Design a protein around this ligand. Sequence first.
Ligand SMILES: [Zn+2]
Ligand SMILES: [Zn+2]
Ligand SMILES: [Zn+2]
Lengths: 87, 45, 65, 114, 263
Amino acid sequence: MSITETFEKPQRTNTLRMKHGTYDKLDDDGLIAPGVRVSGEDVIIGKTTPSKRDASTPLRSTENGIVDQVLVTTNQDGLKFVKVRVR
Amino acid sequence: TLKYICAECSSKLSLSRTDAVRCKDCGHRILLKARTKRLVQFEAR
Amino acid sequence: MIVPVRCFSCGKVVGDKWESYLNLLQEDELDEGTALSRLGLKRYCCRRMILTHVDLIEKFLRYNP
Amino acid sequence: MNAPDRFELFLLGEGESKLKIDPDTKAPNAVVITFEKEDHTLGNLIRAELLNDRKVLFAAYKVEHPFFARFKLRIQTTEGYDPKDALKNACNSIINKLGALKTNFETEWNLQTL
Amino acid sequence: EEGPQVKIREASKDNVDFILSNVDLAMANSLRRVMIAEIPTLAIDSVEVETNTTVLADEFIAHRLGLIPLQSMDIEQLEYSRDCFCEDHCDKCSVVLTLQAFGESESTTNVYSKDLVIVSNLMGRNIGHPIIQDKEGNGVLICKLRKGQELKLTCVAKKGIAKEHAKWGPAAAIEFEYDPWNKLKHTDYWYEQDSAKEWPQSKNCEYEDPPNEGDPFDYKAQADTFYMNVESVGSIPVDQVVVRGIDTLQKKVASILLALTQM
Ligand SMILES: [Zn+2]
Ligand SMILES: [Zn+2]
Ligand SMILES: [Zn+2]
């Protein structure tokens, strides 16, 4: 009840819980966009959970490519879905 | 500009929060994120 | 997906002989062996390049978006 | 990631000289040159020509490891004859040979129809 | 002219069948290698992609583009970006080209190297012109577009060498042979019944005299007379590959005399 999660660039506040990889590649909607070149432990999906406990997806450590497609959808429960495919 | 594309009708959507996740006439609940304008450089190798 | 630009083994430019090769078969009703030599592909490394290629792009193009 | 840049096969990185000359202790009148950013193209050559010289007592080259671009050339020569000179000589002797060859080619080239 | 002597058999815009003679195998080889690895050439070495809705990937396309042979006739009048005193790339060390294609028709639209367009200033030197040798002036087939798909691109040709990447290679293959009659006995022939009957007699067996039954082994013969044939890919006139070959190899031994000297 009145406790969700949101895909948006996190920037530390009363929790600061985040991680090393940079978020500078995310857009304010919390998702990188196609064309952008990622690597290291870069953040591909920025998600938060309440004031702000970081719950974001960082790229696979040993990997690095270019974003090939980000898909935003909905489930049968009306859940916001996100699928980032990296090439 | 355009912040999103549609799974099918290709129409360049782009809406804020509470707008659910559909499109115009093609209520496809899919939508693609649209490329960046920050041109990517490639090594010809 | 598409005709490689060059023969992996030696470098011969081959990305310019796919349409020709294709015509040399349909419209001239030649055989791949003769067709290839007439395109100048004499050594087997370059031969395999074309004789073996699989033009899968033609199938990708059939997808709407 | 581990792969070094390809230009490092022909481009001297910093602190590197094209040649490192060293006095062989095992034998007299002998030296060991380390060519940096060079391979079998120059090695077998300078080696081969270094052999046509009769006052040359020993000439051999080898690239210790295919990973790095660099070969070692050992030259030994009769007393009074400096290996350094034999190399110079083996070089000029080569540079000429190639000049001649170049000419003869541009010559025969013209006499061709097409 | 006393020394390494050429003796061309065939010749054309692509091959230079010839016979090197009066030369150490080593030199015949070093020259063979250089033609393959160290002759400077222009080739797309950087691709900026504005738009690609094609069926391929940017890196995919970008790869082919670098394999598209480009005019490198006056290449020496161009410099390597790494030496050029500019910031990145200028008309003194590079050539910029463009590729814009839109699937307009409904039938499959093809994209070729002819559709590449120089945008920099060649300053008088023949350089950067995509090579074309097909009977219809199309050149290499870079991509295929369906109606509606697009491909906006910007490349940057630069001076490079084979050692760095095979795209900068001017040669295509280099037939090479010697002692077509195994007189020097450099190779030992494998056989089931008959060495002679099982192994085909190569081209160059006509250009030489078969040994004679009783003649003892010629233990002093060396390896001179090499039957080559260079094949250009187009970035450079065949005659040139050989020529410039002998050249680069020449400047190499030279950069060495200058080391001892300034040493
Ligand atoms: Zn729609
Ligand atoms: Zn081949
Ligand atoms: Zn410049």
